[PDB]
Curated annotation (Swiss-Prot):
<feature type="binding site">
    <location>
        <position position="503"/>
    </location>
    <ligand>
        <name>(1,3-beta-D-glucosyl)n</name>
    </ligand>
</feature>
<keyword id="KW-0378">Hydrolase</keyword>
<feature type="binding site">
    <location>
        <position position="515"/>
    </location>
    <ligand>
        <name>(1,3-beta-D-glucosyl)n</name>
    </ligand>
</feature>
<keyword id="KW-0326">Glycosidase</keyword>
<keyword id="KW-0119">Carbohydrate metabolism</keyword>
<feature type="binding site">
    <location>
        <position position="364"/>
    </location>
    <ligand>
        <name>(1,3-beta-D-glucosyl)n</name>
    </ligand>
</feature>
<feature type="binding site">
    <location>
        <position position="431"/>
    </location>
    <ligand>
        <name>(1,3-beta-D-glucosyl)n</name>
    </ligand>
</feature>
<keyword id="KW-0961">Cell wall biogenesis/degradation</keyword>
<feature type="binding site">
    <location>
        <position position="360"/>
    </location>
    <ligand>
        <name>(1,3-beta-D-glucosyl)n</name>
    </ligand>
</feature>
<feature type="binding site">
    <location>
        <position position="443"/>
    </location>
    <ligand>
        <name>(1,3-beta-D-glucosyl)n</name>
    </ligand>
</feature>
<dbReference type="GO" id="GO:0071555">
    <property type="term" value="P:cell wall organization"/>
</dbReference>
<dbReference type="GO" id="GO:0005576">
    <property type="term" value="C:extracellular region"/>
</dbReference>
<feature type="region of interest" description="alpha/beta subdomain">
    <location>
        <begin position="225"/>
        <end position="323"/>
    </location>
</feature>
<feature type="region of interest" description="beta-sandwich subdomain">
    <location>
        <begin position="1"/>
        <end position="224"/>
    </location>
</feature>
<keyword id="KW-0964">Secreted</keyword>
<comment type="similarity">
    <text>Belongs to the glycosyl hydrolase 81 family.</text>
</comment>
<dbReference type="GO" id="GO:0000272">
    <property type="term" value="P:polysaccharide catabolic process"/>
</dbReference>
Length: 752
């Protein structure tokens, strides 16, 4: 009932859960499994994809509302409803007492794509998928309608079995261009679309509420404008149905460049149809478009969506280019702190304990210990650092074993492989990590942090035959490569939307969502560190690709650093939860003002420096939070605000820290006013004093190795490298600076 993996194991039978005498129904219901029923055809076998923009198609009989931008769509017994949020559908609402804001559209229907033979389909199943498109199959015996659609596709491709095409409207549309087999039309409220059938198959019902075509293939396009030249361009690719779509990437270690090429492969539905499509690019893509793709832009082809303006680009492929900025295992010892005061805070942290038994609360605790251990090493407190790492080893050697001393499955503190979906689940579970396959990057990222800190000091422990095998299993669950026997590809990540999606099932009418983008960035950071420590180049590079891409989406959709995406009337300077179809300044729990910003900053670690790349943003966001609070009396998590403020004004951060850090004493789970429960006084004091000495993050300098950071204080650069190798290295920076680094050390600020 368990599979050995090095010294560890995972359960292959669902354990008899030890509830610990807790009767709370919510807690008990968490210790379960994801849904038994998966709505997929027999063409889709093996580990099932989860955490996707389209997931509600797999989980609900039909689907919930989905956002294949620029459209929204939903499957129903009667067919596929299609919608586009026009400006008149978009609203920005504020609930002052709740402190929440919501940017959202409507769940309406512009028309329904129907099958002539039935309006009572039995179910809609996933019939195929690739990196960002899905093929949904509405089924009723011989009657079938296969719908191919995707984020960044202004087409919906429709294939019929045993019937023909129907477009049904509640109010008769305006057919403003009638080319026989191709029509340009607008809804009563002036939304512009087109429909395409093979030559000779002419549309009927023009002027009525129901447009019909005898063809067994049609495509729908959202048109950017009521424009016959655009209609003519959409005709060129309307018969090229996307079958394959891959996002292939490379990391150039010398330059830091992460290059991603998005390539489709299509199947021709008429003779001579080109192999290509029209893509709709999101801001995080087109702002980084490779020179070589520029000639494919369709300049005036714009769509407004929740994430700003999408633009059209034609052809088989396009490429984006991003810059990986490095990460560190920890800030080094470069601050002007009182070392005895910091040593005292390190000892104070021995009082801390996890505030729950589930993967998330245990995760926060081990992240806390892993953050303290290098600081203890720096202060010369090696015995204390060893105590922290020993505690990490004790916790991980427990959780990474599924059996007890007698060889029976444990009832808690273990991992289990759900074969139905194909996912590793940890018990105790929380935040629907097991029942909805939620948040695996957020939770398991902390387990990887703990393992990476152990590996930094003890390479033996981290070997695959020891505890490394189980760590690499957890990593595969949340970010597997292609053709993994146990897990779907890159579970958490949507390579086209550019971000992770936290909900395994996506059964919301706003599509999927992600709240803590920083806990996603923390997961990617820790995989980079773990992979560097254990000599796994392929895994490291995949995590670099994720870190760097996710960063591009965070800066657009969570922060809107360019002040182009959020509506002018939206008050806050952050979106807390991004959805497929809407944006909230709100949290998944009842919180105050600080938390609706800081949930996208925490935890602070050696990969957090991406938060400081846009100093005008950091100032604008801080000042807005300060305005709303009305002072620097933060309602909760004060230390996170001080650490954030230190990115641009460490003098201010320092004065706030000095005034309040010692307000309360040792760890108290009931009181997060000053110190957030995943944080410590030691971490806070070490971070702010390091920033005070280093100055600003400098993202204009790259290096030819991946574990580094560059800071700039009034034109004076500080270069930091950590070397995980047994051998000395030389690191070349993009500004001409060159340094040597000894084995298993920082170049500067090793401490002692
Ligand atoms: O959707 C991902 C997020 O899910 C959150 O839990 C949700 C519950 O709070 C709510 O009552 O029910 C929905 C399902 O309808 C749950 O998804 C977690 O708390 C978040 O951590 C998670 O990212
Ligand atoms: O401060 C006590 C409150 O903490 C909340 O936990 C938050 C998580 O839900 C969220 O996923 O992460 C943040 C940051 O780690 C946590 O503070 C509980 O949900 C509340 O019920 C609790 O009162």
């Amino acid at each position: 009932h368990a599979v050995s993996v090095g010294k560890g194991s995972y359960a292959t039978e669902f354990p008899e859960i030890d509830f610990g005498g807790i009767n709370d129904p919510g807690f008990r219901d968490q210790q379960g499994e994801p849904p038994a029923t998966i709505y997929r055809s027999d063409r889709v076998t093996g580990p099932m994809q989860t955490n996707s923009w389209w997931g509600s198609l797999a989980v609900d009989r039909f689907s919930m509302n989905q956002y294949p931008h620029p459209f929204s769509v939903r499957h129903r017994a009667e067919g596929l409803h299609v919608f586009y949020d026009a400006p008149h559908n978009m609203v920005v609402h504020e609930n002052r007492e709740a402190g929440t804001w919501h940017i959202h559209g409507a769940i309406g229907t512009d028309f329904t794509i129907k099958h002539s033979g039935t309006a009572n389909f039995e179910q809609a199943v996933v019939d195929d998928y690739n990196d960002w498109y899905v093929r949904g199959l509405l089924e009723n015996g011989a009657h079938q309608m296969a719908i191919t659609y995707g984020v960044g596709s202004p087409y919906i491709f429709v294939e019929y079995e045993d019937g023909s095409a129907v477009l049904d409207f509640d109010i008769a549309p305006d057919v403003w261009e009638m080319n026989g087999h191709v029509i340009g039309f607008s809804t009563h409220d002036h939304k512009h679309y087109a429909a395409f059938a093979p030559p000779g198959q002419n549309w009927s019902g023009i002027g009525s509420k129901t447009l019909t075509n005898n063809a067994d293939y049609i495509a729908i396009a959202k048109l950017p404008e009521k424009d016959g030249n655009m209609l003519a361009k959409f005709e060129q690719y309307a018969y090229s149905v996307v079958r394959d779509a891959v996002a292939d990437w490379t990391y150039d270690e010398a330059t830091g460049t992460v290059t991603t090429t998005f390539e489709v492969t299509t199947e021709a539905k008429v003779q001579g149809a080109p192999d290509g499509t029209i893509f709709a690019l999101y801001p995080h893509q087109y702002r980084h478009l490779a020179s070589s793709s520029e000639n494919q832009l369709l300049q005036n082809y714009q769509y407004e969506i929740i994430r700003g303006t999408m633009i059209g680009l034609e052809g088989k492929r396009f490429t984006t280019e991003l810059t990986y900025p490095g990460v560190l295992p920890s800030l080094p010892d470069l601050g002007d702190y009182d070392r005895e005061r910091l040593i005292g805070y390190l000892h104070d942290a021995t009082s801390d304990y996890p505030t729950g038994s589930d993967t998330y609360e245990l995760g926060k605790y081990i992240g806390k210990l892993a953050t303290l251990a290098p600081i203890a090493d720096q202060m010369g407190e090696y015995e204390l650092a060893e105590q922290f790492r020993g505690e990490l080893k004790d916790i991980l050697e427990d959780w990474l074993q599924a059996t007890n001393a007698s060889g029976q499955l444990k009832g808690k503190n273990l991992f289990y492989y759900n074969e139905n979906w194909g996912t590793i689940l940890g018990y105790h579970a929380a935040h629907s990590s097991a029942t909805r396959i939620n948040d695996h990057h957020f939770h398991y990222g902390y387990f990887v942090k703990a393992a990476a800190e152990i590996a930094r000091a003890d390479q033996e422990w981290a070997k695959s035959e020891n505890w490394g095998g189980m760590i690499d299993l957890l990593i595969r669950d949340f970010m597997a490569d292609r053709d993994d026997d146990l897990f779907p590809y890159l579970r958490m990540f949507d390579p086209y939307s550019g971000n992770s999606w936290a909900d395994g099932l996506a059964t919301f009418d706003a599509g999927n969502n992600q709240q803590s983008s920083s806990e996603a960035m923390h997961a990617w950071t820790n995989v980079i560190l773990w992979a560097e420590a254990t000599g796994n180049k392929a895994l490291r590079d995949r995590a670099i690709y994720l870190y760097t891409t996710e960063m591009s989406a965070i800066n657009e959709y969570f922060f809107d650093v360019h002040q182009e995406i959020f509506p002018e009337e939206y008050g806050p300077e952050i979106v807390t939860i991004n959805w497929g179809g809407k944006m909230d300044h709100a949290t998944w729990w009842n919180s105050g003002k600080v938390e609706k910003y800081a949930i996208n900053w925490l935890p602070f670690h050696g990969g957090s420096l991406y938060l400081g790349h846009h100093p005008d943003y950091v100032d604008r966001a801080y000042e807005e939070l300060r305005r709303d609070i009305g002072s620097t009396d933060w309602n909760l998590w004060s230390n996170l605000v001080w650490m954030y403020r230190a990115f641009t004004n460490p003098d201010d951060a320092l004065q706030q820290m000095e005034a309040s850090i010692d307000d309360y004493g040792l760890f108290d789970p009931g009181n997060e006013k000053i110190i957030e429960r995943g944080s410590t006084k030691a971490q806070t004091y070490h971070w702010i004093h390091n920033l005070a000495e280093l100055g600003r993050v400098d993202p204009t300098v790259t290096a030819n190795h991946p574990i580094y950071a560059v800071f700039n204080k009034n034109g004076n650069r500080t270069y930091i490298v950590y070397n995980f190798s047994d051998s000395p290295i030389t690191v070349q920076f993009s500004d001409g600076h060159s340094i040597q680094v000894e084995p298993h050390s920082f170049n500067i600020g090793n401490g002692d």
